[PDB]
mmCIF file of C-alpha atoms in Angstrom:
data_model
loop_
_atom_site.group_PDB
_atom_site.id
_atom_site.type_symbol
_atom_site.label_atom_id
_atom_site.label_comp_id
_atom_site.label_asym_id
_atom_site.label_seq_id
_atom_site.Cartn_x
_atom_site.Cartn_y
_atom_site.Cartn_z
ATOM 1 C CA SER I 1 0.000 0.000 0.000
ATOM 2 C CA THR I 2 0.885 3.675 -0.211
ATOM 3 C CA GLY I 3 -0.481 7.016 0.906
ATOM 4 C CA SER I 4 -0.005 10.593 -0.298
ATOM 5 C CA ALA I 5 -1.266 13.738 1.435
ATOM 6 C CA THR I 6 -0.740 17.427 0.880
ATOM 7 C CA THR I 7 0.758 19.417 3.743
ATOM 8 C CA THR I 8 -0.017 23.141 3.969
ATOM 9 C CA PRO I 9 1.701 25.971 5.878
ATOM 10 C CA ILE I 10 -0.450 27.302 8.734
ATOM 11 C CA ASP I 11 0.507 30.921 8.051
ATOM 12 C CA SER I 12 2.504 33.207 5.771
ATOM 13 C CA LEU I 13 5.772 32.418 7.597
ATOM 14 C CA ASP I 14 5.600 28.609 7.350
ATOM 15 C CA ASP I 15 5.545 28.420 11.147
ATOM 16 C CA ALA I 16 4.240 24.850 10.864
ATOM 17 C CA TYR I 17 2.531 22.596 8.344
ATOM 18 C CA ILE I 18 -0.816 20.801 8.669
ATOM 19 C CA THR I 19 -1.914 17.633 6.933
ATOM 20 C CA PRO I 20 -5.498 16.327 6.898
ATOM 21 C CA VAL I 21 -5.982 13.000 8.704
ATOM 22 C CA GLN I 22 -9.145 10.884 8.765
ATOM 23 C CA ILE I 23 -9.956 9.404 12.183
ATOM 24 C CA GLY I 24 -12.811 7.075 13.012
ATOM 25 C CA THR I 25 -15.973 5.845 11.348
ATOM 26 C CA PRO I 26 -17.522 7.831 9.788
ATOM 27 C CA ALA I 27 -14.327 9.780 9.204
ATOM 28 C CA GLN I 28 -13.580 12.830 11.308
ATOM 29 C CA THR I 29 -10.961 14.878 9.462
ATOM 30 C CA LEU I 30 -8.484 16.746 11.659
ATOM 31 C CA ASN I 31 -5.514 18.810 10.491
ATOM 32 C CA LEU I 32 -2.445 17.466 12.249
ATOM 33 C CA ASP I 33 1.133 18.652 12.533
ATOM 34 C CA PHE I 34 3.300 15.775 11.290
ATOM 35 C CA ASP I 35 6.264 15.721 13.638
ATOM 36 C CA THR I 36 9.336 13.595 12.927
ATOM 37 C CA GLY I 37 10.678 14.754 16.311
ATOM 38 C CA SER I 38 8.047 13.004 18.451
ATOM 39 C CA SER I 39 6.081 9.769 18.561
ATOM 40 C CA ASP I 40 2.568 10.484 19.839
ATOM 41 C CA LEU I 41 -0.540 10.934 17.685
ATOM 42 C CA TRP I 42 -2.679 13.215 19.831
ATOM 43 C CA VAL I 43 -5.750 15.274 19.084
ATOM 44 C CA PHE I 44 -7.996 17.962 20.433
ATOM 45 C CA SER I 45 -11.140 16.129 21.426
ATOM 46 C CA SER I 46 -14.541 16.206 23.070
ATOM 47 C CA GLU I 47 -12.586 15.472 26.280
ATOM 48 C CA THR I 48 -10.349 18.557 26.055
ATOM 49 C CA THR I 49 -10.927 21.091 28.833
ATOM 50 C CA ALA I 50 -13.364 23.527 27.238
ATOM 51 C CA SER I 51 -11.425 26.681 28.146
ATOM 52 C CA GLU I 52 -8.397 25.220 26.343
ATOM 53 C CA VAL I 53 -10.184 24.794 23.001
ATOM 54 C CA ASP I 54 -10.276 27.860 20.743
ATOM 55 C CA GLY I 55 -11.271 27.111 17.155
ATOM 56 C CA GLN I 56 -9.690 23.677 16.707
ATOM 57 C CA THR I 57 -11.578 20.803 15.174
ATOM 58 C CA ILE I 58 -12.115 18.074 17.761
ATOM 59 C CA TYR I 59 -12.219 14.292 17.632
ATOM 60 C CA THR I 60 -15.334 12.884 19.326
ATOM 61 C CA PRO I 61 -14.711 9.190 19.982
ATOM 62 C CA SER I 62 -18.325 8.551 21.021
ATOM 63 C CA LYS I 63 -19.340 9.352 17.422
ATOM 64 C CA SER I 64 -16.936 6.799 15.940
ATOM 65 C CA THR I 65 -18.236 3.246 15.654
ATOM 66 C CA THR I 66 -14.664 1.929 15.485
ATOM 67 C CA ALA I 67 -13.303 3.814 18.529
ATOM 68 C CA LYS I 68 -12.413 1.770 21.589
ATOM 69 C CA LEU I 69 -11.094 3.101 24.886
ATOM 70 C CA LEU I 70 -7.634 1.706 25.574
ATOM 71 C CA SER I 71 -8.372 0.785 29.152
ATOM 72 C CA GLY I 72 -6.094 2.316 31.762
ATOM 73 C CA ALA I 73 -3.850 4.069 29.251
ATOM 74 C CA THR I 74 -2.800 7.680 29.735
ATOM 75 C CA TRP I 75 -0.280 9.919 28.031
ATOM 76 C CA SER I 76 1.591 13.104 28.825
ATOM 77 C CA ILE I 77 4.114 14.853 26.637
ATOM 78 C CA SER I 78 6.373 17.823 27.157
ATOM 79 C CA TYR I 79 8.037 19.138 24.022
ATOM 80 C CA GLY I 80 11.467 20.755 24.102
ATOM 81 C CA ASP I 81 9.935 24.193 23.546
ATOM 82 C CA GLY I 82 7.992 23.945 26.808
ATOM 83 C CA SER I 83 4.588 23.164 25.295
ATOM 84 C CA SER I 84 2.666 20.137 26.527
ATOM 85 C CA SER I 85 -0.498 18.083 26.451
ATOM 86 C CA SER I 86 -1.927 14.998 28.154
ATOM 87 C CA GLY I 87 -4.965 12.746 28.295
ATOM 88 C CA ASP I 88 -6.303 9.254 27.702
ATOM 89 C CA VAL I 89 -6.198 6.902 24.729
ATOM 90 C CA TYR I 90 -8.501 5.317 22.179
ATOM 91 C CA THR I 91 -7.734 2.973 19.354
ATOM 92 C CA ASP I 92 -9.427 3.799 16.058
ATOM 93 C CA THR I 93 -9.012 3.697 12.302
ATOM 94 C CA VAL I 94 -6.677 6.383 10.996
ATOM 95 C CA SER I 95 -6.082 7.180 7.333
ATOM 96 C CA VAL I 96 -3.553 9.534 5.746
ATOM 97 C CA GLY I 97 -3.746 10.226 2.035
ATOM 98 C CA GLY I 98 -5.503 6.929 1.336
ATOM 99 C CA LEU I 99 -3.300 4.773 3.603
ATOM 100 C CA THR I 100 -5.290 3.191 6.434
ATOM 101 C CA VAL I 101 -4.183 1.812 9.787
ATOM 102 C CA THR I 102 -6.686 0.010 11.966
ATOM 103 C CA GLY I 103 -6.184 -0.044 15.727
ATOM 104 C CA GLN I 104 -4.029 3.098 15.781
ATOM 105 C CA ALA I 105 -3.550 4.661 19.212
ATOM 106 C CA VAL I 106 -5.292 8.046 19.102
ATOM 107 C CA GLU I 107 -4.323 10.021 22.162
ATOM 108 C CA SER I 108 -7.214 12.226 23.245
ATOM 109 C CA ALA I 109 -6.181 15.431 24.990
ATOM 110 C CA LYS I 110 -7.788 16.317 28.275
ATOM 111 C CA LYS I 111 -5.317 19.185 28.738
ATOM 112 C CA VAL I 112 -3.196 21.242 26.349
ATOM 113 C CA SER I 113 -0.819 24.115 27.059
ATOM 114 C CA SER I 114 -1.520 27.680 26.032
ATOM 115 C CA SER I 115 0.546 27.598 22.831
ATOM 116 C CA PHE I 116 -1.698 24.819 21.480
ATOM 117 C CA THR I 117 -4.921 26.564 22.521
ATOM 118 C CA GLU I 118 -3.742 29.769 20.850
ATOM 119 C CA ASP I 119 -3.081 28.076 17.515
ATOM 120 C CA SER I 120 -6.504 27.449 16.026
ATOM 121 C CA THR I 121 -5.034 25.825 12.899
ATOM 122 C CA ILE I 122 -3.426 22.777 14.539
ATOM 123 C CA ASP I 123 -5.850 20.073 15.675
ATOM 124 C CA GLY I 124 -3.105 17.831 17.103
ATOM 125 C CA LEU I 125 0.186 16.162 16.244
ATOM 126 C CA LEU I 126 1.064 12.991 14.366
ATOM 127 C CA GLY I 127 4.431 11.750 15.573
ATOM 128 C CA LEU I 128 6.831 10.148 13.106
ATOM 129 C CA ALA I 129 9.938 9.612 15.266
ATOM 130 C CA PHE I 130 10.693 6.153 16.662
ATOM 131 C CA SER I 131 8.051 4.457 18.782
ATOM 132 C CA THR I 132 10.484 4.203 21.700
ATOM 133 C CA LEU I 133 9.622 7.874 22.421
ATOM 134 C CA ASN I 134 5.866 7.263 22.639
ATOM 135 C CA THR I 135 4.541 8.459 26.008
ATOM 136 C CA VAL I 136 1.545 6.150 26.497
ATOM 137 C CA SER I 137 1.588 4.403 29.869
ATOM 138 C CA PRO I 138 1.560 1.658 31.012
ATOM 139 C CA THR I 139 1.726 0.131 27.521
ATOM 140 C CA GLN I 140 3.739 2.139 24.999
ATOM 141 C CA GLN I 141 2.061 2.527 21.612
ATOM 142 C CA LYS I 142 3.312 2.518 18.032
ATOM 143 C CA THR I 143 3.367 5.441 15.633
ATOM 144 C CA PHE I 144 1.192 5.539 12.539
ATOM 145 C CA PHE I 145 4.270 4.808 10.407
ATOM 146 C CA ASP I 146 5.380 1.905 12.584
ATOM 147 C CA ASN I 147 1.882 0.379 12.345
ATOM 148 C CA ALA I 148 1.696 0.920 8.567
ATOM 149 C CA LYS I 149 5.242 -0.158 7.782
ATOM 150 C CA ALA I 150 4.798 -3.838 7.049
ATOM 151 C CA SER I 151 1.920 -3.098 4.652
ATOM 152 C CA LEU I 152 3.733 -0.396 2.705
ATOM 153 C CA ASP I 153 5.240 -1.127 -0.708
ATOM 154 C CA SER I 154 8.550 0.108 0.775
ATOM 155 C CA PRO I 155 9.127 0.916 4.480
ATOM 156 C CA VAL I 156 9.628 4.642 3.933
ATOM 157 C CA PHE I 157 7.949 7.987 4.121
ATOM 158 C CA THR I 158 9.035 11.227 2.482
ATOM 159 C CA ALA I 159 8.712 14.882 3.452
ATOM 160 C CA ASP I 160 8.548 17.468 0.684
ATOM 161 C CA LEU I 161 7.769 20.723 2.475
ATOM 162 C CA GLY I 162 7.059 23.862 0.475
ATOM 163 C CA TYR I 163 8.434 27.350 0.917
ATOM 164 C CA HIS I 164 5.382 29.567 1.367
ATOM 165 C CA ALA I 165 3.450 26.859 -0.512
ATOM 166 C CA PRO I 166 1.907 23.423 0.014
ATOM 167 C CA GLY I 167 3.978 20.262 -0.152
ATOM 168 C CA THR I 168 3.566 16.530 0.255
ATOM 169 C CA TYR I 169 3.988 13.642 2.679
ATOM 170 C CA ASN I 170 4.171 10.270 0.922
ATOM 171 C CA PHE I 171 4.114 6.871 2.577
ATOM 172 C CA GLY I 172 5.430 3.692 1.018
ATOM 173 C CA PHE I 173 7.072 5.044 -2.141
ATOM 174 C CA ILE I 174 9.611 7.534 -3.436
ATOM 175 C CA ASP I 175 8.222 9.940 -6.051
ATOM 176 C CA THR I 176 11.136 10.171 -8.461
ATOM 177 C CA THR I 177 9.558 13.214 -10.141
ATOM 178 C CA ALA I 178 9.645 15.245 -6.918
ATOM 179 C CA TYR I 179 13.377 16.002 -6.776
ATOM 180 C CA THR I 180 16.340 16.833 -8.973
ATOM 181 C CA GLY I 181 19.591 14.900 -9.220
ATOM 182 C CA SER I 182 20.078 11.973 -6.856
ATOM 183 C CA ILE I 183 19.118 11.217 -3.274
ATOM 184 C CA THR I 184 22.117 10.987 -0.947
ATOM 185 C CA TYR I 185 21.561 8.629 1.951
ATOM 186 C CA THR I 186 23.246 9.016 5.317
ATOM 187 C CA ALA I 187 23.367 6.969 8.526
ATOM 188 C CA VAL I 188 20.858 7.351 11.339
ATOM 189 C CA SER I 189 21.257 6.733 15.039
ATOM 190 C CA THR I 190 18.024 5.733 16.760
ATOM 191 C CA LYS I 191 19.638 5.732 20.213
ATOM 192 C CA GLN I 192 17.731 8.835 21.342
ATOM 193 C CA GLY I 193 14.548 7.894 19.468
ATOM 194 C CA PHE I 194 15.048 10.542 16.758
ATOM 195 C CA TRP I 195 15.992 10.605 13.089
ATOM 196 C CA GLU I 196 19.479 11.598 14.197
ATOM 197 C CA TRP I 197 22.242 12.007 11.634
ATOM 198 C CA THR I 198 25.544 13.811 11.062
ATOM 199 C CA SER I 199 25.863 16.597 8.539
ATOM 200 C CA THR I 200 29.298 16.894 6.930
ATOM 201 C CA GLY I 201 29.553 20.689 7.181
ATOM 202 C CA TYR I 202 28.273 24.018 5.948
ATOM 203 C CA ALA I 203 28.834 27.117 3.856
ATOM 204 C CA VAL I 204 27.497 30.657 4.189
ATOM 205 C CA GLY I 205 26.426 32.297 0.946
ATOM 206 C CA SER I 206 29.043 31.870 -1.757
ATOM 207 C CA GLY I 207 31.709 31.164 0.863
ATOM 208 C CA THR I 208 33.949 28.131 1.121
ATOM 209 C CA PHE I 209 32.519 24.918 2.534
ATOM 210 C CA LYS I 210 33.646 24.089 6.073
ATOM 211 C CA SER I 211 34.015 20.357 6.627
ATOM 212 C CA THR I 212 32.847 19.633 10.150
ATOM 213 C CA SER I 213 30.579 17.004 11.693
ATOM 214 C CA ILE I 214 27.258 18.354 12.936
ATOM 215 C CA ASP I 215 25.093 15.793 14.735
ATOM 216 C CA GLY I 216 21.425 16.719 14.714
ATOM 217 C CA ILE I 217 17.864 15.581 14.163
ATOM 218 C CA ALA I 218 15.617 15.811 11.110
ATOM 219 C CA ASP I 219 12.557 17.362 12.734
ATOM 220 C CA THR I 220 9.541 18.415 10.672
ATOM 221 C CA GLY I 221 7.851 19.591 13.885
ATOM 222 C CA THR I 222 10.415 22.328 14.592
ATOM 223 C CA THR I 223 10.142 25.524 12.546
ATOM 224 C CA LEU I 224 13.735 26.751 12.520
ATOM 225 C CA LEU I 225 17.272 25.499 11.959
ATOM 226 C CA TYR I 226 19.182 25.232 15.280
ATOM 227 C CA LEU I 227 22.938 24.793 14.934
ATOM 228 C CA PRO I 228 26.069 25.264 17.055
ATOM 229 C CA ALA I 229 26.819 28.820 18.153
ATOM 230 C CA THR I 230 30.008 28.933 16.079
ATOM 231 C CA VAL I 231 28.126 28.097 12.867
ATOM 232 C CA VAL I 232 25.280 30.488 13.612
ATOM 233 C CA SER I 233 27.660 33.351 14.427
ATOM 234 C CA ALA I 234 29.469 32.766 11.130
ATOM 235 C CA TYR I 235 26.153 33.002 9.260
ATOM 236 C CA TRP I 236 24.841 36.181 10.907
ATOM 237 C CA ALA I 237 28.220 37.905 10.654
ATOM 238 C CA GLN I 238 27.464 38.121 6.914
ATOM 239 C CA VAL I 239 24.300 40.179 7.535
ATOM 240 C CA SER I 240 24.920 43.861 8.281
ATOM 241 C CA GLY I 241 23.240 44.884 11.497
ATOM 242 C CA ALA I 242 22.356 41.345 12.620
ATOM 243 C CA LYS I 243 22.783 40.628 16.312
ATOM 244 C CA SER I 244 21.757 38.193 18.991
ATOM 245 C CA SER I 245 19.079 39.738 21.177
ATOM 246 C CA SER I 246 18.588 38.225 24.614
ATOM 247 C CA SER I 247 15.341 40.198 24.998
ATOM 248 C CA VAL I 248 13.862 38.850 21.754
ATOM 249 C CA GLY I 249 15.334 35.368 22.215
ATOM 250 C CA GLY I 250 17.706 34.952 19.296
ATOM 251 C CA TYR I 251 19.302 36.511 16.274
ATOM 252 C CA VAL I 252 17.478 39.387 14.688
ATOM 253 C CA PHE I 253 18.378 41.349 11.595
ATOM 254 C CA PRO I 254 17.258 44.486 9.787
ATOM 255 C CA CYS I 255 14.204 43.695 7.700
ATOM 256 C CA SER I 256 15.858 45.706 4.878
ATOM 257 C CA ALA I 257 18.624 43.089 4.573
ATOM 258 C CA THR I 258 19.142 40.618 1.778
ATOM 259 C CA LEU I 259 20.004 37.309 3.496
ATOM 260 C CA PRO I 260 22.709 34.979 2.189
ATOM 261 C CA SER I 261 21.968 31.334 1.527
ATOM 262 C CA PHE I 262 23.113 28.598 3.880
ATOM 263 C CA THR I 263 24.435 25.264 2.637
ATOM 264 C CA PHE I 264 24.576 22.054 4.656
ATOM 265 C CA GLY I 265 26.389 18.856 3.777
ATOM 266 C CA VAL I 266 24.869 15.415 3.393
ATOM 267 C CA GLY I 267 27.816 13.153 2.752
ATOM 268 C CA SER I 268 29.506 14.617 -0.316
ATOM 269 C CA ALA I 269 26.246 16.276 -1.402
ATOM 270 C CA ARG I 270 25.090 19.787 -0.587
ATOM 271 C CA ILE I 271 21.636 21.218 0.189
ATOM 272 C CA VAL I 272 21.278 24.961 -0.346
ATOM 273 C CA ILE I 273 18.791 26.900 1.776
ATOM 274 C CA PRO I 274 17.978 30.151 -0.058
ATOM 275 C CA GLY I 275 18.351 33.316 1.974
ATOM 276 C CA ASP I 276 14.640 34.098 1.825
ATOM 277 C CA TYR I 277 13.884 30.835 3.685
ATOM 278 C CA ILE I 278 15.781 32.265 6.666
ATOM 279 C CA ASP I 279 13.489 35.321 7.035
ATOM 280 C CA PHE I 280 10.816 34.926 9.738
ATOM 281 C CA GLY I 281 9.584 38.475 9.476
ATOM 282 C CA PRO I 282 9.085 41.305 11.929
ATOM 283 C CA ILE I 283 9.611 40.416 15.575
ATOM 284 C CA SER I 284 6.304 42.188 16.320
ATOM 285 C CA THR I 285 3.788 43.752 13.957
ATOM 286 C CA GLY I 286 5.231 46.833 12.280
ATOM 287 C CA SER I 287 8.780 46.319 13.512
ATOM 288 C CA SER I 288 11.757 46.742 11.195
ATOM 289 C CA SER I 289 13.661 44.102 13.171
ATOM 290 C CA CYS I 290 13.180 40.653 11.670
ATOM 291 C CA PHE I 291 13.623 37.263 13.319
ATOM 292 C CA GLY I 292 16.238 34.898 11.940
ATOM 293 C CA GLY I 293 15.524 31.377 10.762
ATOM 294 C CA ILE I 294 18.928 30.049 11.822
ATOM 295 C CA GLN I 295 19.401 30.105 15.591
ATOM 296 C CA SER I 296 21.820 28.711 18.137
ATOM 297 C CA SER I 297 21.222 25.262 19.592
ATOM 298 C CA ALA I 298 23.353 26.099 22.617
ATOM 299 C CA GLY I 299 21.370 25.038 25.668
ATOM 300 C CA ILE I 300 18.967 22.882 23.631
ATOM 301 C CA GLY I 301 21.397 20.002 23.910
ATOM 302 C CA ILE I 302 20.933 18.920 20.304
ATOM 303 C CA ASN I 303 21.110 20.458 16.845
ATOM 304 C CA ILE I 304 17.795 20.531 15.002
ATOM 305 C CA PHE I 305 17.343 20.424 11.231
ATOM 306 C CA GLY I 306 13.840 21.868 11.346
ATOM 307 C CA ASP I 307 11.591 23.069 8.569
ATOM 308 C CA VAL I 308 13.967 25.847 7.408
ATOM 309 C CA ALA I 309 16.437 23.134 6.411
ATOM 310 C CA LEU I 310 14.083 20.342 5.428
ATOM 311 C CA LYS I 311 11.940 22.462 3.100
ATOM 312 C CA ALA I 312 15.026 23.045 0.922
ATOM 313 C CA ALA I 313 15.143 19.293 0.235
ATOM 314 C CA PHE I 314 13.209 16.197 -0.671
ATOM 315 C CA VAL I 315 13.732 14.060 2.455
ATOM 316 C CA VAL I 316 13.444 10.285 2.707
ATOM 317 C CA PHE I 317 12.808 8.749 6.118
ATOM 318 C CA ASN I 318 13.870 5.167 5.443
ATOM 319 C CA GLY I 319 12.473 2.853 8.109
ATOM 320 C CA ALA I 320 14.183 -0.301 6.914
ATOM 321 C CA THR I 321 15.699 -2.608 9.547
ATOM 322 C CA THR I 322 18.655 -0.242 9.658
ATOM 323 C CA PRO I 323 17.065 3.177 9.199
ATOM 324 C CA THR I 324 18.686 5.878 7.062
ATOM 325 C CA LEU I 325 17.858 9.393 5.860
ATOM 326 C CA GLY I 326 17.999 10.551 2.262
ATOM 327 C CA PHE I 327 18.250 14.129 0.994
ATOM 328 C CA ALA I 328 17.866 15.442 -2.554
ATOM 329 C CA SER I 329 17.726 18.930 -3.965
ATOM 330 C CA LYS I 330 14.456 19.900 -5.641
#
């Protein structure tokens, strides 16, 4: 089997991407944030504290003839950015782009943190990291991909995120028309539960490539590119007037600037992030200070190849017995 679904930016900055997901019988379609940095499929629901729901579409398990309470199971997740959610668990039928999993754990939120409430466009998350990170207790549950894997034509999914435009998540096949050149594959460590890999270096603009190992995670659920302070300083030094602002929480730059590209290495291959992908717009409405899309990972504890990086590539998440990641230009 295969599946193919369009993923759409939630706003004009590509702060996140939402993908429609069918849950239950009859289908209830929710727009979920596909997150290769976590492993829980959770949704706003009829059980979510009413004051914490503000415009989201909810899953109502009582209206699904295929929903079953997973007795005794609870979940609670805290993301690295400080957001969180928790609740109980149903199993139900879940379909993405025509690919159906029966008995998928659907984690129903009883509580969500303010950042989720305040984003009316995201109805929940669909985790695509390794199932070892799933938070369901006392019986850990599998991700949608893990459940689908054996049925797929090939045990892969691909992320093709758009810049200020829709893109595609495919399951079970590689669309050879969706990228240019070849896909370069690189090793993955699953030791921390992530799609963790080592970039071979970077360049800023038309500058020389610096060969250096940068361990990080391919994370569709993180907006920005978080890299070591040395790398990030080298990038922003090429933008007149750019500075790190402790009050704002990162590098800012004059909105009048033209940003240089940023290149990262995948083996001997190179992925170029155009400068415009690194612009996250005014820090507050009407400001002429703009927020940078490349930020320091210092104090995160890990480097994160978030959407800023991934949207410059066609990315293969290869879930074969020994997982790997593939990157192609597009």
